[PDB]
Swiss-Prot record:
Expressed in brain, heart, kidney, liver, pancreas, placenta and skeletal muscle. It comes from the Eukaryota. It is found in: Nucleus. Binds constitutively to TP53BP1. Binds CDC27, which is itself a component of the anaphase promoting complex (APC). Binds PIAS1. May be required for DNA interstrand cross-link repair. Also required for checkpoint mediated cell cycle arrest in early prophase in response to mitotic spindle poisons. Possesses beta-lactamase activity, catalyzing the hydrolysis of penicillin G and nitrocefin. Exhibits no activity towards other beta-lactam antibiotic classes including cephalosporins (cefotaxime) and carbapenems (imipenem). Belongs to the DNA repair metallo-beta-lactamase (DRMBL) family. Changing H295A: Impaired nuclear focus formation, reduced interaction with PIAS and increased sensitivity to cisplatin. The chain holds residues 700 to 1040 of 1040 of the full protein. It comes from Homo sapiens (Human). This is DNA cross-link repair 1A protein. Induction: During mitosis. The mRNA encoding this protein contains an internal ribosome entry site (IRES) in its 5'-UTR. This 5'-UTR generally suppresses translation while specifically promoting expression during mitosis, when cap-dependent translation may be impaired.
Amino acid sequence: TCPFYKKIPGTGFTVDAFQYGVVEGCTAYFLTHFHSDHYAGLSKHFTFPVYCSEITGNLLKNKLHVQEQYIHPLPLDTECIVNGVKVVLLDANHCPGAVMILFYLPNGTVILHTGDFRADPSMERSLLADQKVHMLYLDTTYCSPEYTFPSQQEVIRFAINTAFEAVTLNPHALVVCGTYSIGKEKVFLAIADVLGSKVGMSQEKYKTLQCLNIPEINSLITTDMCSSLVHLLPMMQINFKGLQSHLKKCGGKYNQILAFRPTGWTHSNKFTRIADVIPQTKGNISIYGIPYSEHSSYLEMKRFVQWLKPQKIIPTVNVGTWKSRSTMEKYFREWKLEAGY
Ligand code: NI
């Protein structure tokens, strides 16, 4: 059944709750972003109101064929009334179109639902600074101190410098980047920019990217593989067998692959700096796992929460095991005693 951490008390609302059938007493279904664990259940047969960003609404219409009459896109950073309740959508610094949702309940309670987010100090100057938040529905994906990772900027600098060096040493090298969802577009777009190439991809992935309102996108991507030396493939294909196979397909245009797997966290982060990352190599194929995250590190999460000073925290991730739940509640208490709220 629908878990309690997907329901907004004092409203008829749910968040990211499309796989439970008709939720009893739900008058408006919000969707924070277009990732499959969150939209699971949506289709052209859905007939309840869906509230979301403009970008998420483009993907619902074009990818899932949700009918236009049930898509209610809202502008960001704008007070809006939904079924009698004031709400605001805020940028979540996750994937394109991802939002956090502020609910102003009739009784005076204010609730923030982060959806999935990568906490950032810039959020401390949004509409969140203007009033007290009582309850926080928090993306706790990486809520443990072992999870450190570099800035997105450091990671993109590494990728750009690696790719440009490799292709300038060997102009017959192909660059390949893995993907299995929206998000992390900076990785492949920054590499293609430095190389003076468009990114080549399947018709399905090109359609997905054309829903994202990215400026000048027609100048950066293409379905013509042959004209491109940065290719995007399913993340599943980013292994030696899959890559050897792909290289056969390019008909001797290329004699080397350099491939990127933008993972979340990996335990090489506990030891190794970004400067010191090395690839796995077999023959003329090299694969780099780069720690490009669209979720908060432990320290970024902690800073956001100690700034916001909520009265109650409800985790939305890692909630399935008692040991995970108890660990997270211990960190919450540490943060509160350290900061004095
Ligand atoms: Ni997500």
